Structures are given as structure tokens and as C-alpha cells.
């Protein structure tokens, strides 16, 4: 059939449902979260803070904020 | 019927390689002058002298090495408490009489 | 063709000459690292998690 000639015919003929693209981008977004979420979780687990304040592990001036 | 390898390839490259390895090693020894006499023994001079004494009969037979040293570790001290060379020799003598 | 063959030859051996120029320096510097020296003092260094331990000979 003519519809079956091209692989991924709907996408190549520009008729595909946009949800397919959204899932691909969402999948990539979820992959990225695997680096950020465990960072926050691990920081809180060992320190009790999600993120440090810059240079908070060093001596700071009295007025430092 | 067409041949890809040497007609006697398996034997040729096994024995041939072994021969070349052996001949190369002899050449290497000659160049460096390495002694080629084989000794199967430990070279501790003091120990070899003690073994000769046992062979000569100066030291009683079946006497342990730790019975002859000037420093003993803890395990050897444990063994020295139960060591009786004289009894061991008598037991061996009894076995020989029974056998003959 | 005659000119092109020379260019191909240079593409191969100009890098080769450069390599040869480096080879001799490489041998020399390697020998310098492993030269037998008449050292008079020994310092023993042990790496541990996470600090360094140093052992030195105390003077008599």
C-alpha cells in the first residue's frame, strides 16, 4: 500500500499525533531528573539541607549573607 | 581441493616454535653468562650443615629443625613441649623389626 | 601523477621524521628517571584513607 511505503509514514507525511513528540521530550526530561533529584535527596540526608549556601563549609565574615 | 595453509602446518608451527624458543634461550644464556647447572636444594648454608650432621649421625635422626635453632616462635614452643625424638626413634626401630 | 606520488610520500614520512626526532629525546629522559643514584637518605611514604604517613630515620 502507498501508506506503508515510507517508514513512520505519519510522521514523514506530517500527520502524526503531537503526543508522540511530547512523550519523547518528557522521557528526556525524566532522564535529566535522575541527576538532580538524588543530588537534593542525598544533600538533605547527610546535611539536612537540600542545597548548601555558597562557601557555607568555610569560615565566613560576620556580615556574610 | 585447494590448500590454504602449509601442508604440515600444525606440526610445523608447534614443534618449530618450540625449537626456536629453546635455541633462543640457550643463546641468551651464553650472551649473559648465566650459570646453567641445576640445583634442587635450598642454599641456606647453616641449615645444609645441620643436615650433613644428621647424615653423619652427629645429630639424632628425626630431630626437628626447630629443635636446633637459637630462636623459637610461639608455635614451635608448643611443639617442643611434646617433642620426644628418642621415643620416635624407638618406635621406628620397632616397626623395622616387625616388618623383617 | 609524478607530483601527486611525492605529495603522498611526504604525507607519510614528514610525520615519520618528526617521530624520529622525538624518539632520541624520549630514550634519554627515560634513562634519567631510572638512573642509579648514590642516595644517602630514605623517606618511606604510606598512603592511607585519607592521610599520608611518613617514616624517617631518627638521628642517633
Amino acid at each position: 500500500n502507498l501508506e506503508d511505503h515510507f517508514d513512520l509514514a505519519e510522521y514523514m507525511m506530517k500527520m502524526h499525533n503531537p503526543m508522540s513528540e511530547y512523550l519523547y521530550w518528557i522521557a528526556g526530561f525524566v532522564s535529566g531528573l535522575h541527576g538532580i533529584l538524588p543530588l537534593l535527596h542525598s544533600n538533605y540526608y547527610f546535611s539536612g539541607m537540600f542545597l548548601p549556601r555558597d562557601n557555607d563549609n568555610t569560615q565566613l565574615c560576620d556580615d556574610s549573607w | 581441493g585447494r590448500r590454504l595453509l602449509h601442508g604440515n602446518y600444525f606440526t610445523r608451527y608447534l614443534f618449530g616454535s618450540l625449537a626456536v624458543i629453546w635455541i633462543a634461550e640457550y643463546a641468551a644464556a651464553c650472551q649473559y653468562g648465566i650459570p646453567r647447572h641445576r640445583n634442587p636444594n635450598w642454599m641456606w648454608s647453616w641449615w645444609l650443615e645441620k643436615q650433613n650432621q644428621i647424615k653423619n649421625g652427629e645429630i639424632p635422626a628425626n630431630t626437628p629443625g626447630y629443635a636446633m635453632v637459637k630462636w623459637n616462635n610461639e608455635a614451635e614452643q608448643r611443639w617442643l613441649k611434646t617433642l620426644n625424638v628418642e621415643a620416635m626413634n624407638e618406635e621406628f626401630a620397632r616397626r623395622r623389626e616387625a616388618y623383617y | 601523477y609524478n607530483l601527486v606520488m611525492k605529495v603522498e610520500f611526504l604525507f607519510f614520512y614528514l610525520p615519520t621524521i618528526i617521530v624520529f626526532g622525538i624518539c632520541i629525546p624520549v630514550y634519554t629522559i627515560n634513562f634519567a628517571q631510572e638512573e642509579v643514584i648514590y642516595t644517602t637518605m630514605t623517606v618511606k611514604v604510606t598512603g592511607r584513607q585519607w592521610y599520608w604517613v611518613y617514616e624517617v630515620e631518627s638521628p642517633t
Binding site: - | - | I18, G21, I22, P25, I29, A32, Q33
Partner: protein
């Protein structure tokens, strides 16, 4: 001895042993050759 701010220190800096000097000289010896290799090739990247 110690790093200093905004220093190129191309090839090393502040040797204190004869071997340390050797390391720096070796890099400086080859550095001009590296430039020659780069410049000669890059000059011909064109139509």
C-alpha cells in the same frame, strides 16, 4: 611550589630538582614542533 592566580605556566613552573627542569625543557623542546604541525595543516583548510 604552589599554584598562583591566572598563570599560564605553559609546560610547568618553579622547578626545584634537576628532573623537574628536564620535564619543562622537554615540553618546550616539542612545543614549537606542535605549532608547526598545527599552523601548516590549518593554513590549508580552505576552498
Amino acid at each position: 611550589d604552589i599554584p598562583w592566580p591566572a598563570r599560564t605556566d605553559w609546560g610547568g613552573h618553579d622547578p626545584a630538582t634537576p628532573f623537574a627542569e628536564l620535564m619543562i625543557n622537554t615540553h618546550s623542546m616539542f612545543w614549537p614542533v606542535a605549532i608547526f604541525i598545527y599552523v601548516s595543516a590549518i593554513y590549508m583548510v580552505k576552498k
